[PDB]
Amino acid sequence: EIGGLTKCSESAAFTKRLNASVKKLEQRASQYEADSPPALALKQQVERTQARFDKYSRSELLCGADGLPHLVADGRWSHAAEFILPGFGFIYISGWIGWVGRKYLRAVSTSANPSESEIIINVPLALKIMTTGYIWPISAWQELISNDLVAVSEEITVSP
Amino acid sequence: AALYTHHQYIAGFLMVGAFAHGAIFFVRDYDPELNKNNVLARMLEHKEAIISHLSWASLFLGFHTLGLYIHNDT
């Protein structure tokens, strides 16, 4: 496989880890008894453990010799779920936040008191501006090609 | 083991000194007029760009590297 790794579904170390983990919890549960609230909790915990390992097994994750999942991020779409797809999520959300923030700052900049509106936010306006960020990619590009995003050497600079 | 650590540390001191004397140059020997629109002068024209971007790089590397380590620890 890529990098000499092995699929986790076919890795013995991965399975050994699972068995060991469950055993530890079960050994603890033995002390408590029957429907004792402590025992029921530990029992539920083992279920989650079994589920986690199963999910990873059914996945396309590749494990190493230690039996631990290793992520691939070279651009291959075979393992896009590991980095590329989640990556888009971050970019979309982050841009949303940044775009809306810039919009609000510029909007309140022309108000009676531009500094009071930064310490005491105008919630009504903020919410409106915040909702308009879902199309930030389009808006940003449009602003760039309209020479409204990047300024032109009319900004303060150092002495040298 | 000793040899590696020895040369790497010396390398660090030598690197820092280079930048130090580079600064001494600007303060003492730089002639703004001679180097007009020179490759060197233009560097001092977009100083903010260089510094700001280097800052971003440092922040990106710092947040994620530390974050991933802490995730693994927890």
Binding site: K55, S59, L71, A81, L85, P86, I120, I121 | -
Partner: protein
């Protein structure tokens, strides 16, 4: 009321509320969709 709303509109207060909401929704997502290291 108006004045109280202004206090509730102060930066510190709004941050706390927003972060509490954000933290909560993240926690809730993990409660119902737990243990994910990738989009499956």
């Amino acid at each position: 009321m108006n004045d109280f709303q202004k206090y509730l509109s102060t930066a510190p207060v709004l941050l706390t509320l927003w972060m509490t909401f954000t933290a909560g929704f993240i926690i809730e997502v993990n409660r119902f969709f737990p243990d994910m290291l990738g989009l499956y």
